[PDB]
Design a protein around this ligand. Sequence first.
Ligand code: GDP
Ligand code: MG
Length: 169
Amino acid sequence: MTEYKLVVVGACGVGKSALTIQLIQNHFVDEYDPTIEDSYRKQVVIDGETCLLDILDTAGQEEYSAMRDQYMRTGEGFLCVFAINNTKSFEDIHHYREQIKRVKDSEDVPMVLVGNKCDLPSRTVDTKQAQDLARSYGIPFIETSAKTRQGVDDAFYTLVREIRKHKEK
Ligand SMILES: Nc1nc2c(ncn2[C@@H]2O[C@H](COP(=O)(O)OP(=O)(O)O)[C@@H](O)[C@H]2O)c(=O)[nH]1
Ligand SMILES: [Mg+2]
């Protein structure tokens, strides 16, 4: 079956691991070492297609930069995650967007912008500001909560749909 290589990127603390574990295992893990980087797999049906999601939960700097370049080149779509209560993590999206395009040497890379922790009333990034950024990139924007599961399937399944649209060209 088709496998989709997804990569979850974003500043430390935004909820990359929590989102991935919620997607894969259907529970909220509120404490997971920020320095652990690992891949997870799940076989799902998306729009009638039985497929495999092969998801890299990134954790930032690698032993060697070649390891980062390798996962960006092999990755097919990227969840660019910020936390709605951390403005610096939102600003960091500019860096991730650029770095992925730079490594893949492509202006057309499937991505989805994810604003996580939307169960918290505490918010420094309003939806309008995040929509502005996603509009500038021409990518979807989804607010999520790894805690409540809101938006979680939508974020990952939308990324698969973005990969499909890229492939058909
Ligand atoms: N309230 C809330 N907390 C979250 C959410 N996602 C992650 N967290 C918390 O934010 C912190 C960092 O999450 P983690 O998954 O380790 O982020 P990572 O460094 O991006 O992998 C942890 O204390 C989690 O409990 C969420 O959707 N809502
Ligand atoms: Mg993590």
